[PDB]
Amino acid sequence: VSEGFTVKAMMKNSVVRGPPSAGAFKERPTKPTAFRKFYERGDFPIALEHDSKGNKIAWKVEIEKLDYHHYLPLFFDGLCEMTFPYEFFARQGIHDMLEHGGNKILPVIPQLIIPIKNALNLRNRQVICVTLKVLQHLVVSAEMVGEALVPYYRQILPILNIFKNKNVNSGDGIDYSQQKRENIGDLIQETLEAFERYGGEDAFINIKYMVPTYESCL
Amino acid sequence: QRKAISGYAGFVPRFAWVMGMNYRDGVTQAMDEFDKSQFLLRNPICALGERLP
Amino acid sequence: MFKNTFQSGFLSILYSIGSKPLQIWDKKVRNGHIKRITDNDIQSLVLEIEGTNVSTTYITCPADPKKTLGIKLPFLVMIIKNLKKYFTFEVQVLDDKNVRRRFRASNYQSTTRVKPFICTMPMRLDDGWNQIQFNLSDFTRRAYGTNYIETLRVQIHANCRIRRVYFSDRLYSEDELPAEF
Amino acid sequence: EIPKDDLDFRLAALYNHHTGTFKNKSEILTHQETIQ
Amino acid sequence: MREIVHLQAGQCGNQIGAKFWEVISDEHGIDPTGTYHGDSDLQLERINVYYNEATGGKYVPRAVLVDLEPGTMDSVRSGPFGQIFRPDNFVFGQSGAGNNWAKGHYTEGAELVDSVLDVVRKEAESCDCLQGFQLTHSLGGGTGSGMGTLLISKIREEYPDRIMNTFSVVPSPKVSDTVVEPYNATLSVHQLVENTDETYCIDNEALYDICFRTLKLTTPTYGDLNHLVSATMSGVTTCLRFPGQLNADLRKLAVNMVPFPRLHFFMPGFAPLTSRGSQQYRALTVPELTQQMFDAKNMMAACDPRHGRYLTVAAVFRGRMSMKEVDEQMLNVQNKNSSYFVEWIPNNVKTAVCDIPPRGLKMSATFIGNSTAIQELFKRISEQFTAMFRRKAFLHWYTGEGMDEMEFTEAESNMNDLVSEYQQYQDATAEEEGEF
Amino acid sequence: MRECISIHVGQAGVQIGNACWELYCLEHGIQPDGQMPSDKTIGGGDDSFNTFFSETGAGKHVPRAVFVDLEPTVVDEVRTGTYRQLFHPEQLITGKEDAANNYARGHYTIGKEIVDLVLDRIRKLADLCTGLQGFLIFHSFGGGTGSGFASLLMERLSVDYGKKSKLEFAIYPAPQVSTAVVEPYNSILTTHTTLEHSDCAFMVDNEAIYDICRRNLDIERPTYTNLNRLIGQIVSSITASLRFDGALNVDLTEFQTNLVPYPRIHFPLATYAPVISAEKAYHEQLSVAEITNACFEPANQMVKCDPRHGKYMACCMLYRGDVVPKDVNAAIATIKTKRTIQFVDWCPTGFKVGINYQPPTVVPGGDLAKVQRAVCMLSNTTAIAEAWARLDHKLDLMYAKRAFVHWYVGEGMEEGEFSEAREDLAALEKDYEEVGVDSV
Ligand SMILES: Nc1nc2c(ncn2[C@@H]2O[C@H](COP(=O)(O)OP(=O)(O)OP(=O)(O)O)[C@@H](O)[C@H]2O)c(=O)[nH]1
Numbered sequence A: 001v002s003e004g005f006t007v008k009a010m011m012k013n014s015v016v017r018g019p020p021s022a023g024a025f026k027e028r029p030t031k032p033t034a035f036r037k038f039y040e041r042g043d044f045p046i047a048l049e050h051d052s053k054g055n056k057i058a059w060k061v062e063i064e065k066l067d068y069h070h071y072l073p074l075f076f077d078g079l080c081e082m083t084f085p086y087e088f089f090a091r092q093g094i095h096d097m098l099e100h101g102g103n104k105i106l107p108v109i110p111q112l113i114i115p116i117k118n119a120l121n122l123r124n125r126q127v128i129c130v131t132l133k134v135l136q137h138l139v140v141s142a143e144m145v146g147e148a149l150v151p152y153y154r155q156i157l158p159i160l161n162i163f164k165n166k167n168v169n170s171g172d173g174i175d176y177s178q179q180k181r182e183n184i185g186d187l188i189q190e191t192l193e194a195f196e197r198y199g200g201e202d203a204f205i206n207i208k209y210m211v212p213t214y215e216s217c218l
Numbered sequence B: 001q002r003k004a005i006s007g008y009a010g011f012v013p014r015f016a017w018v019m020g021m022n023y024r025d026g027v028t029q030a031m032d033e034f035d036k037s038q039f040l041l042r043n044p045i046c047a048l049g050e051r052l053p
Numbered sequence C: 001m002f003k004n005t006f007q008s009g010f011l012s013i014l015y016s017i018g019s020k021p022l023q024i025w026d027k028k029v030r031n032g033h034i035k036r037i038t039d040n041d042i043q044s045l046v047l048e049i050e051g052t053n054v055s056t057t058y059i060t061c062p063a064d065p066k067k068t069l070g071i072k073l074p075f076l077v078m079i080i081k082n083l084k085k086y087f088t089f090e091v092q093v094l095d096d097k098n099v100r101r102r103f104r105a106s107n108y109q110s111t112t113r114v115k116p117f118i119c120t121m122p123m124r125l126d127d128g129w130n131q132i133q134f135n136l137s138d139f140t141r142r143a144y145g146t147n148y149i150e151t152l153r154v155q156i157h158a159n160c161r162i163r164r165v166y167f168s169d170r171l172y173s174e175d176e177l178p179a180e181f
Numbered sequence D: 001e002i003p004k005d006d007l008d009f010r011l012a013a014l015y016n017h018h019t020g021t022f023k024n025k026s027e028i029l030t031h032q033e034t035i036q
Numbered sequence E: 001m002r003e004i005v006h007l008q009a010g011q012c013g014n015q016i017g018a019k020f021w022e023v024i025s026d027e028h029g030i031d032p033t034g035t036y037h038g039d040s041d042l043q044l045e046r047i048n049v050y051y052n053e054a055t056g057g058k059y060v061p062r063a064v065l066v067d068l069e070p071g072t073m074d075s076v077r078s079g080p081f082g083q084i085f086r087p088d089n090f091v092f093g094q095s096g097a098g099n100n101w102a103k104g105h106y107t108e109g110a111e112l113v114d115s116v117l118d119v120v121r122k123e124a125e126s127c128d129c130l131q132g133f134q135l136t137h138s139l140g141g142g143t144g145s146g147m148g149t150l151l152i153s154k155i156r157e158e159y160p161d162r163i164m165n166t167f168s169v170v171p172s173p174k175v176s177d178t179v180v181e182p183y184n185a186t187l188s189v190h191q192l193v194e195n196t197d198e199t200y201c202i203d204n205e206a207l208y209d210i211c212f213r214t215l216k217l218t219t220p221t222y223g224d225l226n227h228l229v230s231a232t233m234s235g236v237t238t239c240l241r242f243p244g245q246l247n248a249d250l251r252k253l254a255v256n257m258v259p260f261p262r263l264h265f266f267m268p269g270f271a272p273l274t275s276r277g278s279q280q281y282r283a284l285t286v287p288e289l290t291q292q293m294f295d296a297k298n299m300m301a302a303c304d305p306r307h308g309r310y311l312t313v314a315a316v317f318r319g320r321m322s323m324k325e326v327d328e329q330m331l332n333v334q335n336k337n338s339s340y341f342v343e344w345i346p347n348n349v350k351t352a353v354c355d356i357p358p359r360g361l362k363m364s365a366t367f368i369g370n371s372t373a374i375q376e377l378f379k380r381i382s383e384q385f386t387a388m389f390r391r392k393a394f395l396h397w398y399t400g401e402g403m404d405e406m407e408f409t410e411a412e413s414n415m416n417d418l419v420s421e422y423q424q425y426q427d428a429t430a431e432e433e434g435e436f
Numbered sequence F: 001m002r003e004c005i006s007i008h009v010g011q012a013g014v015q016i017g018n019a020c021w022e023l024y025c026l027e028h029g030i031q032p033d034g035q036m037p038s039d040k041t042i043g044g045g046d047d048s049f050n051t052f053f054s055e056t057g058a059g060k061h062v063p064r065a066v067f068v069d070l071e072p073t074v075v076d077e078v079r080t081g082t083y084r085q086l087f088h089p090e091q092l093i094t095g096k097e098d099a100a101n102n103y104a105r106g107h108y109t110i111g112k113e114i115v116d117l118v119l120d121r122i123r124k125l126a127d128l129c130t131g132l133q134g135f136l137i138f139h140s141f142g143g144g145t146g147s148g149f150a151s152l153l154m155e156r157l158s159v160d161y162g163k164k165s166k167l168e169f170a171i172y173p174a175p176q177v178s179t180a181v182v183e184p185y186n187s188i189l190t191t192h193t194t195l196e197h198s199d200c201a202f203m204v205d206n207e208a209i210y211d212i213c214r215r216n217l218d219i220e221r222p223t224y225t226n227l228n229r230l231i232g233q234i235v236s237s238i239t240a241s242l243r244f245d246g247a248l249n250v251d252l253t254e255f256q257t258n259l260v261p262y263p264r265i266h267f268p269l270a271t272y273a274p275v276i277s278a279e280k281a282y283h284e285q286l287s288v289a290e291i292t293n294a295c296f297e298p299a300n301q302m303v304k305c306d307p308r309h310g311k312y313m314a315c316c317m318l319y320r321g322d323v324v325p326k327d328v329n330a331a332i333a334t335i336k337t338k339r340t341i342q343f344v345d346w347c348p349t350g351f352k353v354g355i356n357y358q359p360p361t362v363v364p365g366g367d368l369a370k371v372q373r374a375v376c377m378l379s380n381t382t383a384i385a386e387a388w389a390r391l392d393h394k395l396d397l398m399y400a401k402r403a404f405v406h407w408y409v410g411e412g413m414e415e416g417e418f419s420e421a422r423e424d425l426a427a428l429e430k431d432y433e434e435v436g437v438d439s440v
């Protein structure tokens, strides 16, 4: 065997080893988050009721009046939880408070970038799919928001550049699992599509500065 | 820089004081002033207050 | 092939509905992918080929590299979804001069240039779903000096969604065309 | 056979000029009959 | 007519720059008085790249010296070649940087950035055309890190189509000199990655290792490390100053070595480095140069190149040498060390040759290497930073000067963003289906 | 009434032209100050130097050359060298900023403010010329200015002069060898213009000349000058029928209708037969019968492609020196029966041979030896199709992740100008495959 740039590799069938295969595309170990710590405490005003038509999160408080500056970053940091009765609470809380509630998302937007990067930086596919779906909902759920995210494209899109090459190669066989949008390449391309649709005329050069393989419409 | 013809991108020393001539005589005067300066600087011929105009 | 076929008013040569749509079609994939997808616009299956380099991933009409198909029908219709990306196609045409000539249209071209074997004209698409009505006989009569007898292959490149590539004789406007096309 | 020097260089040599890099005078005109 | 404006910041940058001027003044035959009495023909040719000619026959460097402490400019003045600079370009504060990025950047850099910006305006406007700027500093100190990168940011906003050259001394892994250097390095890198086009990372530990193992020096002072840095910082501008059979200036290397707009951190090196007795018993050939060029011991940064794949390699040669020899050497080195090079780039080596060798050396080469080995230095800085920042170790010297807690946790975010892209481009193959 | 205009763009073009013009000066009696001596004279007439030089009243000869680069670093040695009094100083055109290996820079950003001067100088050189049919440009296919500024220069000259012939002499990038990283992009982009505006584009690799200097010449570790001298001998072979009377003289337009079958298949190879050193030339009679076979050797081609994976179209073989028509008749008849050298079925003639009477000249301080007979072969073959599939592979290896593209988007050029040229090279490969089929 060999080692590298030495006289070891100067031989006649010197077999050279290779690089140590650095930390890309591998799931990083997780860490406990603030969502579980604040939830076992019990300060959240939420309760889980099991309706017949699916699990629905029940709110014991008027959802219109709530400190979004204290609750929305706390729910966004809960996306890093893979344990089953917590990921529903994080996902459904983000979706319900983004949909029920307007003209309060904007001042919270500079505070929810670090939890978004934390959720995306864990290289697990399910959490990445979920945060991409809630980002697609976030950029459309209100006005004046998409071109408020455009300075923060340098902190979301770096890991969106990783998984743009993940589709099924079955040339004639249909991908049956289409309803559960679990493949990440199309989800990333639709997230970038929504970042271009809402975000004004400065978004294209930022997406090109982050994701170089990008193709623009309009 | 002595044998340089017309349009020439090199640095000819003492050239941005030559006044109203072409490139060739400008180079000649520039290199002559340069050689005069070096020779008067090292070899001590001129007395005090006599080595500059 | 397609020498003993009847070659009536139309001839379907691709369809997204069936067991093996790309049976007679070759499939090269490099930095790309090919898959069948239910569309949310027409509520039916479409083909789906795309990749970073449009030229590396494509599909060619006869499977064998040296085998050539013979289609008498002059027209060419393609129901292709516009994705605002780089999409090219290319045909090969036989003439009375008995030489093989190639016409290529690309989304990124802006000039119409004429060469003895290639003719690269541009092509513009609309917003959503549309059919590119091609006329091989007139494009051989106008740009070149000869006529049209057979077309030998078609080649569909990346960044597009394919459904029902077919030839025809006359431009069926909207009503004499059957509902399945 | 080889009724010329051109055929000795041309046919039976295994050298691929498009592929082989920085070969000396002897690694061009190596034949198949040398190997087997 | 392609001229570069030189700047040096801080106590480390000033010594590095002073050794650099000492090196290139003897390259062009300039006396310590500022007068030319060299011997070679080609010395006075492209001296307008770095110098200006004054009335009476002098040659002044295009150097702007910035400091925050006044006692470090007279050390530079009282050096061997400290009397060639203009006194007008000597900008300096009165209150020290205190090893604070805050005082270098916000509240003691703000009153002196104007004066140095006017001086660098005066220097970079007498030229007919301008190619770029040079800045020598270190990412560990106070005014070497808070002021120099602010100056880079304020110069980039006025000259956006010109190159920028930063030659930084990043803090070493196991050699510690100041307590607070992880904070300075993390605050400095995140804006040294969006404000300059070419950056060279030189570690003091790797320089010490070279001086111990390669040079066999008994007692290496701080002059020898600066001589090592100047031997490779002046090899990237020898194509501008001397004719060659295949020339390559700063922008040529900027285009060739940078695949994507952020990965512009490079690892320097020098090829014909030899000991005091082994110099005389040595044969100097291109296959001899290549082994000392490519080995891990000669790397000026403490990142092992065997720990990652090379992205793009530059090798500027100096000396009257053949071209097929250099050609076949790079071809062999790539061909059978094939797993250490990026496989979606076909050729990763740029070759340049110059006809004027360094004095006393009959053949030399300099190495510029963009590798994914540099991802471990940034992770090391982040690890040395997170331990202090987890318990808020020394923040009252910074936050009490006036910052917000988020200004420190965004530097780590940009550090991690820099690391992840290097990891991705290390693991990326030619086809995009094998990593999953 | 015959002349040629030489435009050497890029550092490679200018360094090639240095050896070329020293060769042309030695081919006549012209001292490097530009004046013929009166102490002694060579046997020359006024019809010899008309192709490449111009005459003043006093007796000074001036080349029909323009030396243009965006750098100074290659042109001031022409201004300060031995051949500094030969050139008119306005021909030596020197820019300020570099091309930085960018087709974008030399095509849009820096070449656009210098093209109005070189075009005006070309115009001023083409009005002193009675006849027409010149324009012999020299560039490399890997650099920035030699691929960007040459493309724009040919673009302007095609609409400024209409027909002429843009003779183009490429240094095409070697298969396993390149001294830059962004060479495939530049080569594809300059091929997109050379493929439609040059009338027959000559092809030369540096690696094959390295091999030829390695084996035929016995030299070890060659430099660029040895490559440039052999390239200059090849170019002097082409214009040998324009300055010296021979048995079968070939005009520049004569072999364009002979070599080029189709409007795109105009990339011929080269071969120079008696390239042997001084210690080897005097020990063998280099007769026509074996220097003819030296042209068809697989290892003597200066483009890295075996002719054995292709079929020849036409060959333009320009002999010079002690050559008789029956000798080349027997030499061509020898080759036509060998079953390895394959020809297409639609070219039963297959050859074109011209005979000159002037032997090639030596350069004092050179490497070749004085031979009486020399052959330059111009093969148009299908074998060059394999040299562009590798360029396709090298382009798709990097473009598929859009590496280095943003340095080209930054100067004027839109993103699809890469795909626009890659589709043209793919069409070229398909044309080469289509033309090479047999006829059933
Ligand atoms: N065969 C041969 N090739 C040369 C010679 N000089 C330079 N080259 C080629 O030039 C290529 C590098 O690009 P250049 O043409 O020199 O660059 P340029 O046109 O001056 O553009 P810049 O890089 O911006 O300076 C290399 O691949 C060499 O093959 C030469 O003397 N002979």
Ligand SMILES: Nc1nc2c(ncn2[C@@H]2O[C@H](COP(=O)(O)OP(=O)(O)O)[C@@H](O)[C@H]2O)c(=O)[nH]1
Pocket (backbone or CB within 6 Å): E009, E010, E011, E012, E013, E015, E016, E097, E099, E138, E140, E141, E142, E143, E144, E145, E146, E169, E177, E178, E204, E222, E223, E225, E226
């Ligand atoms: N190469 C080199 N490094 C030095 C020298 N002097 C100090 N340093 C390094 O510079 C670092 C301190 O940077 P500093 O001078 O405080 O930067 P400043 O605060 O901006 O002036 C230390 O870690 C030293 O290792 C020198 O003479 N040469």
Ligand SMILES: [Mg+2]
Pocket (backbone or CB within 6 Å): E247, F010, F011, F071, F143
């Ligand atoms: Mg150049």
